[PDB]
Design a protein around this ligand. Structure first.
Ligand code: K
Ligand code: K
Ligand code: K
Ligand code: K
Ligand code: K
Ligand code: K
Ligand code: K
Ligand code: K
Ligand code: K
Ligand code: K
Ligand code: K
Ligand code: K
Ligand code: K
Ligand code: K
Ligand code: K
Ligand code: K
Ligand code: K
Ligand code: K
Ligand code: K
Ligand code: K
Ligand code: K
Ligand code: K
Ligand code: K
Ligand code: K
Ligand code: K
Ligand code: MG
Ligand code: MG
Ligand code: MG
Ligand code: MG
Ligand code: MG
Ligand code: MG
Ligand code: MG
Ligand code: MG
Ligand code: MG
Ligand code: MG
Ligand code: MG
Ligand code: MG
Ligand code: MG
Ligand code: MG
Ligand code: MG
Ligand code: MG
Ligand code: MG
Ligand code: MG
Ligand code: MG
Ligand code: MG
Ligand code: MG
Ligand code: MG
Ligand code: MG
Ligand code: MG
Ligand code: MG
Ligand code: MG
Ligand code: MG
Ligand code: MG
Ligand code: MG
Ligand code: MG
Ligand code: MG
Ligand code: MG
Ligand code: MG
Ligand code: MG
Ligand code: MG
Ligand code: MG
Ligand code: MG
Ligand code: MG
Ligand code: MG
Ligand code: MG
Ligand code: MG
Ligand code: MG
Ligand code: MG
Ligand code: MG
Ligand code: MG
Ligand code: MG
Ligand code: MG
Ligand code: MG
Ligand code: MG
Ligand code: MG
Ligand code: MG
Ligand code: MG
Ligand code: MG
Length: 186
RNA sequence: AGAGACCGAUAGCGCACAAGUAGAGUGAUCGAAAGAUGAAAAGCACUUUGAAAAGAGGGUUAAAUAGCACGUGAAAUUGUUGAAAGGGAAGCGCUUGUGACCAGACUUGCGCCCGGCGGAUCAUCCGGUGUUCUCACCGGUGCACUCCGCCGGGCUCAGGCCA
RNA sequence: CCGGGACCGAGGACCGCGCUCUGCAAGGAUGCUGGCGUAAUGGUCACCAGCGACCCGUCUUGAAACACGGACCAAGGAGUCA
RNA sequence: GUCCCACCCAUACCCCGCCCUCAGGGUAGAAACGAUGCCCUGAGGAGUAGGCGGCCGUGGAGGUCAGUGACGAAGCCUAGGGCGUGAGCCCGGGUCGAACGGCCUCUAGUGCAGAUCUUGGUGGUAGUAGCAAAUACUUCAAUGAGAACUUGAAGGACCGAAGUGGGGAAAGGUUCCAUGUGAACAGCGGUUGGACAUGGGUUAGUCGAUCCUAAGCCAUAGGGAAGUUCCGUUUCAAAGGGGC
RNA sequence: AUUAACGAGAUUCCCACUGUCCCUAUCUACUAUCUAGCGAAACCACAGCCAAGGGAACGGGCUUGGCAAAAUCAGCGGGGAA
RNA sequence: GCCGGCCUCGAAGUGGCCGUCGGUAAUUCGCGUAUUGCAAUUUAGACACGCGCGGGAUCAAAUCCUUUGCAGACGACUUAG
């Protein structure tokens, strides 16, 4: 179908997606944002350390009236949590993409999370019961997830010069000064 | 049974659909929401990862930016990427600056002279036909200092923006 | 009667009132010269800077009001017919 | 306190340009004119409630452009352009798939920010308030992708015969039993379920109903009431049953 | 007008008793609090630091001053004429 | 004026002496200047920052984690590894 990047050619990359997944959208957004631009192996290790509560996911946007911990000093922040259920879903998709890379014939030794994105899905409906005979809604917030992996090169050492454009519409008095200084210096 | 300067799915009857239906009330009674894949299902064979739901390849089609959560697909609200600002709100009016991006205008035209090239037939007169009854058209004559077109060289004039 | 500066050039054949009368400053700007011919002049947007700037609708002598309605968006919504 | 110079700036005053409104003139033996046009001259411009004029848009109808269109109509997006004082009009780029427009007349269910307005959809609050009555769970093994709330065994506990036990009446209607299972439901999980799918299950001369009458309700004889119907139950009635 | 017995009926004093008080201290269980899973509602013109002034005679916004530095957690009951 | 050697300077650390080297109309001359076309900033200073060479010098810590209870709602704090 149509991924959101559209500038990555589906020949030198691998991708995976999943839709209508019944997990918290707010928790998954904070988890996906922590692993973005990382290597495939570093990310897989990190997600398991979260499940075992040895490393923490920093909460930046959706962090209203939450708790504090010492495992957040790694990220320079003070509020962090351990979204176990979110990490499980992400690991499943990262494994599927890595499997897709092997079938194509890529080199899984150095792959990079190039694109990762979480969107809101249609909600599901339940009800509560309140005092004085009133009924209120009780809803869940699922999500869509997709990602793309590409190889890393980080190899550019080409810098341009004034060759692209030269002084082209100078005045007659400007041209006179340039020539005189050229003659004097040589 | 035939029609209309009527309405076009929040409209028109409450009902374009298994509608006086599903549902509520002890009962008399109350009473909805809900139309559109494609010309044709040709409704995705096979391989691979996964416990499975599914994903990635590969197929059908004019089109999958039409996959049954299906014509087109707006706003509120949200994700990623890119650009920028932030010492107890922000937004707005007048006027410069910086950065990014951009519409026009201009590229020549008429005339005169000199040379070359090509074609005619320029003025006049005779016949025919129109018409505003004196002005034209067609046929014939004309045949090189006339008429028309192109190219080469020189000259005058007019031409864009800011001073 | 002589100097020094600033802003402006509407009109588009002739005709008029006149004068210092081969002509003119008299019913509204012409003459000469240089640079450049493109993002240079010009335009749109974003942001910083100087000055300015109370929330709309409504009743009321008097509304920014410690007076009432208004969380946001789409579609419907009120002087007609005999 | 009194007197004197110079200087600063209002949308006021003076001069110039342009817009509109009002007033006054010119223009045919027509080489003549959107005569509803064009040329010349002067003055003026605040505004709620309210009055009048001119114009711009929307859905349909008659006429006309011998109008545009699958070589792409309509609709939608666009810190890309041009015109208009303004409501608005026109063009470029993208998406898309079957109809649509200009001009003069005709016609109306014809122009929205408000009405604690109607229907539908969506935010901040916010991963927040909370998920704390009824004393309580622990070890090993097995099943399974996955086990605190599934099964076995072993410990520890509660109900304590006016029971958290064994059976019924009203009410419900398959909730009963076996096998299996993706989603949804069991406000945590779930391999378990009163959930979901496929099959099976209720046997009477003796237990009930059926028979009798109670409080009561309604037919028949009759009397009211325009009538739907009201009274009346043994009465002011020629009202039955037994044998060969 | 009196009146034995009776009263979850109204009132005054006495004995015993005590954290009602001088004057407050300590302990236990469940919360709150942190984590995994699940997950609402009221309300909302726009917002949210002050002193004085004038003003519809008690300003978050106006005028003149004081000042003024990211993003945040547990409590609190002055104001928001909540 | 750049360097080097001696002294000196504490309010937010400065000045002086000496030496080598380089430049230098107080007087008077000889060659060069044009064409930037009759104006168009006189692109010229000082500090910061970046980049590229060539030489020297150097081989460190903090957080998570486990632990303590002189501390504590959670972070944080006093300790040990
Ligand atoms: K908290
Ligand atoms: K209806
Ligand atoms: K019913
Ligand atoms: K086609
Ligand atoms: K295709
Ligand atoms: K389509
Ligand atoms: K004028
Ligand atoms: K009112
Ligand atoms: K109000
Ligand atoms: K119309
Ligand atoms: K287009
Ligand atoms: K949650
Ligand atoms: K309990
Ligand atoms: K119990
Ligand atoms: K029987
Ligand atoms: K028998
Ligand atoms: K029976
Ligand atoms: K019977
Ligand atoms: K009886
Ligand atoms: K009767
Ligand atoms: K009593
Ligand atoms: K609390
Ligand atoms: K939690
Ligand atoms: K006051
Ligand atoms: K003001
Ligand atoms: Mg708080
Ligand atoms: Mg709390
Ligand atoms: Mg409740
Ligand atoms: Mg109730
Ligand atoms: Mg919600
Ligand atoms: Mg009909
Ligand atoms: Mg509908
Ligand atoms: Mg309808
Ligand atoms: Mg549809
Ligand atoms: Mg497929
Ligand atoms: Mg298409
Ligand atoms: Mg949808
Ligand atoms: Mg669609
Ligand atoms: Mg949007
Ligand atoms: Mg701003
Ligand atoms: Mg002839
Ligand atoms: Mg002029
Ligand atoms: Mg020139
Ligand atoms: Mg510019
Ligand atoms: Mg002001
Ligand atoms: Mg007040
Ligand atoms: Mg009122
Ligand atoms: Mg209100
Ligand atoms: Mg409609
Ligand atoms: Mg007026
Ligand atoms: Mg209509
Ligand atoms: Mg089109
Ligand atoms: Mg836009
Ligand atoms: Mg079609
Ligand atoms: Mg209407
Ligand atoms: Mg509206
Ligand atoms: Mg209004
Ligand atoms: Mg909580
Ligand atoms: Mg509970
Ligand atoms: Mg509670
Ligand atoms: Mg239990
Ligand atoms: Mg007991
Ligand atoms: Mg006991
Ligand atoms: Mg059972
Ligand atoms: Mg079972
Ligand atoms: Mg549950
Ligand atoms: Mg579950
Ligand atoms: Mg289950
Ligand atoms: Mg069932
Ligand atoms: Mg019996
Ligand atoms: Mg009767
Ligand atoms: Mg009778
Ligand atoms: Mg105050
Ligand atoms: Mg006062
Ligand atoms: Mg206020
Ligand atoms: Mg101020
Ligand atoms: Mg409180
Ligand atoms: Mg208060």
């Amino acid at each position: 179908v149509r991924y959101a990047a559209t500038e990555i050619a589906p020949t030198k990359s691998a991708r995976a997606r999943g839709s209508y997944l019944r997990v918290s959208f707010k928790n998954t957004r904070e988890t996906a944002q922590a692993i973005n631009g990382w290597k495939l192996q570093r990310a897989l290790t990190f997600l398991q350390n979260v499940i075992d509560k040895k490393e923490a996911v920093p909460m930046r946007r959706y962090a209203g009236s939450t708790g504090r911990t010492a495992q957040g000093k790694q990220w320079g922040v003070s509020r962090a949590r351990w979204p176990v259920k979110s990490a499980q879903f992400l690991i499943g998709l990262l494994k599927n993409a890595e499997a897709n890379a092997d079938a194509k014939g890529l080199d899984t030794g150095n792959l990079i999370i190039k694109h990762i994105q979480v969107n809101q899905a249609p909600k599901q409906r339940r009800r509560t019961y309140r005092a004085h005979g009133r009924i209120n809604p009780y809803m869940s917030n699922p999500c869509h997830i997709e990602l793309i992996l590409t190889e890393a090169e980080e190899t550019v050492q080409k810098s341009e010069a004034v060759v692209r454009d030269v002084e082209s519409h100078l005045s007659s008095r400007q041209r006179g000064v340039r020539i005189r200084r050229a003659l004097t210096a040589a």
